[PDB]
Scaffold this active site. Structure first.
Site, PDB file in Angstrom:
ATOM      1  N   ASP A   1       1.303  -1.721   0.200  1.00  0.00           N
ATOM      2  CA  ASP A   1      -0.356   0.221   0.041  1.00  0.00           C
ATOM      3  C   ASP A   1       1.010   1.285   0.181  1.00  0.00           C
ATOM      4  OD1 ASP A   1      -1.760   2.296  -0.097  1.00  0.00           O
ATOM      5  OD2 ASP A   1      -2.524   1.721   1.973  1.00  0.00           O
TER       6      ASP A   1
ATOM      7  N   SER B   1      -0.659  15.799 -12.589  1.00  0.00           N
ATOM      8  CA  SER B   1      -0.526  15.161 -13.311  1.00  0.00           C
ATOM      9  C   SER B   1      -0.809  16.005 -14.409  1.00  0.00           C
ATOM     10  CB  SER B   1      -1.827  14.142 -14.149  1.00  0.00           C
ATOM     11  OG  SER B   1      -2.601  13.714 -15.191  1.00  0.00           O
TER      12      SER B   1
END
Ligand SMILES: O=C(NC[C@H]1CCCO1)C1CCCCC1
EC number: 3.4.23.22
Length: 330
Positions: free
Chosen positions: A35, A199
């Protein structure tokens, strides 16, 4: 040193991925959910409340000659899906795919919430975010990666998750045969303890790329792709009959649909998520309404590039002095 381990979907939907991890002496192998959105290595154990264990493999520290109680240490964590777990702490030897850390903090669960109990395939979590998020008190502990880093050939790990298939986590090296083209690296902020990056935009299907900055985290422990409501609406508007359902808890679409791809930007490069990756199947058994793999982050407070996005790429988690993230097509 290096390590390499195969990671395997837990079910036919790729709801999560499990990777075998050796703990203790003699080894006890548990299947852990790696994770990159948290920083605790915790396991079901001989100390876990019996009624809360349903098919998981447990760590029994009393059977490990290298286990030592970390005296007075406790931990308690709650995740964004409302699940939680807590307990005490041992140090022990932990190995992944041939890479060994001695004295790793292994957080033994005394209590886990129902979602963990109900998932028989996940024996615990191995956190790979920054150690500043580790919950152990009163002495915060380091992640497996943080402990291994200095010994690794290169201070990196990579995630190569499969679509309805196994994949690979590598530590300490970048397998240049595992991706196409080049790896595009992008800046990371560690201020919130995550692999947080920006992004450069998105496209829906064959549509025009929209340049827009989208701050979010690379999180192998989150199943879906969570993006701003504007972006998510633009995607689902291209799917006949798709709608946001308050009762179901997100966007659903007719199971008869063929989904468009979704592209996200990494610098000047582009990662394309095939439409099929965005199908999470019937909302309940036998339903013709299917759950979408791209959902709004509006309720979360952060955008999350979860498995839906990451499994479309070869992803480098670069833990150099200034950390960065790399993405390649594959
Ligand atoms: O809770 C989260 N994802 C799901 C949990 C479930 C078990 C592993 O991850 C995210 C939420 C955003 C911040 C980082 C954690």
């Amino acid at each position: 040193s290096t390590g390499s381990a195969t990671t395997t979907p837990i079910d036919s939907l790729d709801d999560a991925y499990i990777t075998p991890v050796q703990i203790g002496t003699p080894a006890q192998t548990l299947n852990l959910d790696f994770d990159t959105g948290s920083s605790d290595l915790w396991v079901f154990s001989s100390e876990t409340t019996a009624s809360e264990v349903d098919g998981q493999t447990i760590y029994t520290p009393s059977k490990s000659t290298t286990a030592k109680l970390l005296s007075g240490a406790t931990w308690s964590i709650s995740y964004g899906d409302g699940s939680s777990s807590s307990g005490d702490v041992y140090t022990d030897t932990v190995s992944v795919g041939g890479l060994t850390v001695t004295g790793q903090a292994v957080e033994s669960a005394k209590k886990v919430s129902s979602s963990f109990t109900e998932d028989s395939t996940i024996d615990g979590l191995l956190g790979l975010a920054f150690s500043t998020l580790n919950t152990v008190s009163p002495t915060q502990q380091k992640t497996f990666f943080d402990n291994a880093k200095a010994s690794l050939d290169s201070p990196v790990f990579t995630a190569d998750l499969g679509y309805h298939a196994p994949g690979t986590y590598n530590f300490g090296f970048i397998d240049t045969t595992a991706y196409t083209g080049s790896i595009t690296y992008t800046a990371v902020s560690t201020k919130q303890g995550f692999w947080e990056w920006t992004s450069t935009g998105y496209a829906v299907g064959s549509g025009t790329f929209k340049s827009t900055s989208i701050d979010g985290i690379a999180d192998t422990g989150t199943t879906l792709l969570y993006l701003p409501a504007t972006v998510v609406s633009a995607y689902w508007a291209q799917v006949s009959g798709a709608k946001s359902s308050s009762s179901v808890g997100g966007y659903v679409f007719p199971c008869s649909a063929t989904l468009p791809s979704f592209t996200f930007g990494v610098g000047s490069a582009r990662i394309v998520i095939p439409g099929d990756y965005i199908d999470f199947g019937p909302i309940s058994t036998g339903s013709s309404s299917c759950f979408g793999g791209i959902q709004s982050s509006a309720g979360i407070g952060i955008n999350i590039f979860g498995d839906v996005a990451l499994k479309a790429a070869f992803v480098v988690f670069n833990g150099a002095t200034t950390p960065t993230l790399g993405f390649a097509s594959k």
